[PDB]
Enzyme design. Structure first.
Site, PDB file in Angstrom:
ATOM      1  N   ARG A   1      32.420 -27.815 -31.264  1.00 34.86           N
ATOM      2  CA  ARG A   1      33.837 -28.111 -31.492  1.00 34.86           C
ATOM      3  C   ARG A   1      34.185 -29.525 -31.049  1.00 34.86           C
ATOM      4  O   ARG A   1      34.856 -30.268 -31.765  1.00 34.86           O
ATOM      5  CB  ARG A   1      34.739 -27.101 -30.776  1.00 34.86           C
ATOM      6  CG  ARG A   1      34.664 -25.674 -31.341  1.00 34.86           C
ATOM      7  CD  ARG A   1      35.511 -24.725 -30.517  1.00 34.86           C
ATOM      8  NE  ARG A   1      35.063 -24.777 -29.133  1.00 34.86           N
ATOM      9  CZ  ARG A   1      35.788 -24.396 -28.083  1.00 34.86           C
ATOM     10  NH1 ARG A   1      37.013 -23.907 -28.243  1.00 34.86           N
ATOM     11  NH2 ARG A   1      35.277 -24.507 -26.865  1.00 34.86           N
TER      12      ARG A   1
ATOM     13  N   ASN B   1      36.155 -21.615 -32.808  1.00 41.76           N
ATOM     14  CA  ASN B   1      35.146 -20.564 -32.764  1.00 41.76           C
ATOM     15  C   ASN B   1      35.699 -19.258 -33.312  1.00 41.76           C
ATOM     16  O   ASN B   1      36.867 -18.943 -33.109  1.00 41.76           O
ATOM     17  CB  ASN B   1      34.697 -20.328 -31.323  1.00 41.76           C
ATOM     18  CG  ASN B   1      33.797 -21.427 -30.797  1.00 41.76           C
ATOM     19  OD1 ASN B   1      33.297 -22.266 -31.548  1.00 41.76           O
ATOM     20  ND2 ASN B   1      33.555 -21.408 -29.497  1.00 41.76           N
TER      21      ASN B   1
END
Length: 90
Positions: free
Chosen positions: A19, A37
């Protein structure tokens, strides 16, 4: 022209700096959007910006950070909505 994609990434893609690296690369390439996620172990996100920048980012997403192991990138092409900034969500 400005375009938007919704992407999903499979593989070793959580717990690998995915990320934060996605946000870093997205910003470098001048894109807006987000990354998060998912409970199934995958990563999902949106890219929005000049199509050339989006195309470069899709190229990058096939590798991710060195520690990741990307097995598949799923891409859906969409109309831009006016994303502001590139954010990590969740």
């Amino acid at each position: 022209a400005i375009v938007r994609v919704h992407y999903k990434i499979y593989g070793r893609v959580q717990g690998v700096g995915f990320r934060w690296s996605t946000q870093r690369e997205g910003r470098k390439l001048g894109l807006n959007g987000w990354v998060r996620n998912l409970p199934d172990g995958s990563v999902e996100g949106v890219l929005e910006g000049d199509e050339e920048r989006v195309e470069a980012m899709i190229g990058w997403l096939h590798q991710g950070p060195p520690l990741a192991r990307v097995t598949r990138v799923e891409v859906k092409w969409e109309q831009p909505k006016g994303e502001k900034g590139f954010r990590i969500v969740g």
